[PDB]
């Protein structure tokens, strides 16, 4: 957190490299290594670079600035210092997540991290609240197909919570948990998931900024540790058809004045009015939130309408068929689980749109619908239409049009992020709709 | 720096070999190893060879002397002593960069290192200045193509500043930085570059001679360490079509009387008249400087007119589309970035022509044009012609003809370097224009 | 020549398909097959399509019309009727070369065949002349490389005029000559040429239109018969480095009032003033004619300045070192051989520019230089500069700039052909200068 606490770690623990990490518009991490020199001269050089930051070409980063105005800076947040465990111990490598700033020393408008800081500071100023998030990012461990090395397949034919040798990843998950604990994570649980080769490593909830910094670090840690064990980890929302997809369920709650505002001992389901207003806001902008929280073309193969998925815009208690599920835990742990996201989204922008839509419901005091305790997959389309259970868009372009017409998310993301995201994703969608797919070749080459 | 300091290190550190290194006309390093014998007899033998120098066949070195007058000598610069880290630690190998001298003990006219010393001593005598340079030499890490071992491809599908495992070179860059630090380099930053398998390792600026000595050692260090990790590093300006090329942006500035002459607190853009006169001189001889700073046929595939490259002869503040870019840093760090060079050039001759053209503008007090803050790539050829933004030559022969007619660079390089360079490069160009290329076979074999 | 003569041959010889052939701007032949029906109804259908022609999409043809004005027509030239021998004999396939016409029934401006007809009709109207041409189009017979099937090599290690089995093409040349004789050719001689696998099949001279129609049919006849004998023929100007290239020497002469105007019994070298004026005109526009007669990038690897080639702009008697050679035959056979062309050029445009530059000399009565009887390759560059022997451009772009500034060839080709040719060839040149060649990879990957 303090300059001296970082410099004295570097002196005693023999740190040789400092990675200045950040994220592009799509949530891909980017960094530059700075070599620390020995003695006081090296520590005073590092002090200048930690306080004043360093320059970088912004035109090469996705969704940042043009070539004619490329000069940018990185101001390190010292409260995010950590030692990368996958790197060597002697002459160790360390990281410090930064905020992208303009040449004039002003926070960059198109920065995803600064976008989340802005909305959290605005929430803390207006309501004196703290936005807490706890995600469940699932992933797949892959190995080369023996019949064809150009394709990849799942690492094992394991099921949900299966034991070894059926589950061939206890050693891979073991090292992942050790690596995350060294990075400052409070790991809660680890196990095999429903689909073959699928796994899930959960971690404790925290404020949206610390949680988004943890999601970026979690994705790199899982990919780099898998390569050490000769495997390849992917956070693709649906790498294989006919089996479960990778989902990042976001358990969330807001605490006004250091108290659990979502809990109300004397109320229906022990849920406060603030909780219901927040849920109403998420359900209102649900068709627009999935553009950010599900930004890939493949996301709409897991989150597919008309088929078993968290596509139905409705809330329910202890029911995994609806888009929102209220876990049975009460008191401090009273929360809502937004099941629509997948680990392909930028966490900084995902928590921004969720907090903005949720706070829109709290500010206007919007009325939430009744909980659909029944299984929604077993219901017919005519029955769901009578109840008013709408579905999330069927494809990426359908979600981008909903995001474009939404003014609540446009203001939260800002003109720079909102317009660049739509422009990048429309070019990505155009590339998909023009390409001749393998499905088409299989179905129409015979005609 | 002195004879005794070198012999004191050689004695204690068990140095067993001394490489007498130098460079040919094209900037290719050349050296001869000397074994240091044990005891006082070995130290006194090494002493005699360090002061009086040693002989070598000059006819075999490129652009040096004929067979009928081949006897030459190497006078070591004792301050350039360094232990090669890629060589063993026990019975360590050391190097000493030398100045090529004639049999009569007079500095050789056709020596690139002596050419840079001459112009720097002339500048220090006339203006009491110090010419500082800080380059950014980019390179590619390659691996054999699995589909064909005779061809090479990039080591990874990484982008700008990408993180591991997408960036497969943190271990290669780690050892590069450690090796350069042992050689006396002040490494500033290291990261992955825009094109696949492309990387960039930056180092602190220094006087042109110490910087040119560092560029030669840097190129060898990067190539030798890559071979240790089973890869092959290349400083080719454009090894692959459709992706960024290797560029060596030269950040430079002159300090008259130990003061930053380029900075002026009370002036437009906080840039002095001396800075504008220097920029005017570079832009004047821009068509001739690219012959030396871009001496390969392949250089004009990266630095290609009509396409996105630093080809437009103009200057601008924080704009990477023009040939010169003035970084936003001010005070001591006030400088100009000549973006046209690539790491294929001889650094000793590149800094000589840049200082000569720049000083031609300072001596005559030439008027620089207005800065083109707009993106020059988006401009049309008719618009660029109205403004007067000329382009650098389209090929090697076009640049050699410009260098031949330029009298400012002819005098700085000297009759020996100027004529031998043109003769060697014209034979190189003739070999290219007569050879039947793979592009021609693909396009015209069908006709 | 008339509709009835063509329908009478079709009736008796059992012709089942009628190809309507023509050429694009680059000289590539293009055609559409029309199946002839049996009985009177089929002959009356064929009569209608022969008299009125047929429609086709002009936007798909190179250098013709845009997509918004694509409707075009083909008016058959009945004199160019011929039977394709390589096609089956029973239910034979006949061809008829056509003139491209606009929807309004007016000759198309951008038609290469109509361009040659226009200048020949203008010459016959103004001077009452007949432009005769007799080319020598050389070609290479290739076979797959046994060490690598992806590459091609020459069919045999034969030399000039060599005998079998050293010359492995007597059977291939035999069938070529039989096929050309059936198409109406007057074949003069056939033999093996200097380079390995290179051959030459000569044919009698005729008026420029009949000769250009023969060059197109010859190129197709050579390639189709080569594929029948398991080989691949190429008219590439220089498929391999270090061996002779394919050249199309154009023997030409003009006959005013049915008399050999180039011959003069009482004159120096027995050559008339009209011959000298014509030669002066070719030498004047020589730098611009090579843009059309040598339109490929590869053409400047055969026609390479500074090396043994017909690059020297000068004329001489029985000397193959100069651009023009006057063969020793006199009387009717008095002619000039323009040695610069290669079989990669469009014959219709090549004969147009040669006749236009030649007639420019006749109209203005330009003075020709003295004949250089000495070998020009043995001369030094300083000696050739004193005599005034200039050289043809070193590359495609250098020739396109000369063609652009030439007003004589601009008028002969017309605004449509002149501008489209320059536009197509500049895009072709830009593709070459941007591509990374195999020569560059071999020479610079090591640096
Ligand atoms: O497998 C896991 O989920 C954690 C590691 C573990 O339990 C083990 O090492 O056996
Ligand atoms: O990756 C770099 O640029 C330097 C090396 C490094 O940071 C590492 O060893 O992880
Ligand atoms: O080979 C030739 O040049 C023509 C054909 C021939 O003479 C032959 O059939 O042997
Ligand atoms: Mg010796
Ligand atoms: Mg830096």
Numbering used by the authors:
A (entry chain G), B (entry chain H), C (entry chain K): 2 to 448
Extract from the study:
The complex with 2OG/Mg2+ was obtained with and without ATP (MtGS-2OG/Mg2+/ATP, MtGS-2OG/Mg2+) in a new crystalline form and both were refined to 2.15 Å and 2.91 Å resolution, respectively. Both 2OG-containing structures show high tridimensional conservation (rmsd 0.279 Å, 441 atoms aligned) while deviating from the apo resting state (2OG/Mg2+/ATP:rmsd 0.694 Å, 374 atoms aligned, 2OG/Mg2+: 0.631 Å, 371 atoms aligned). The structure of MtGS reveals an allosteric pocket perfectly suited to accommodate 2OG via specific salt bridges, hydrogen bonds, and Van der Waals contacts. Binding of 2OG leads to a succession of conformational rearrangements resulting in a catalytically competent state. The repositioning of the N-terminal domain would clash with the next monomer, and therefore a domino effect occurs in the hexamer ring upon 2OG binding. Overall, the transition between MtGS resting and 2OG-bound states provokes a compaction of the outer ring and an opening in the center and middle parts, leading to a more “opened” conformation. In MtGS the 2OG binding provokes a major displacement of the N-terminal domain towards the adjacent C-terminal domain and the overall conformational changes promote a restructuration of the Asp50ʹ-loop, leading to the repositioning of Arg321 and the Glu-flap, yielding an active conformation.
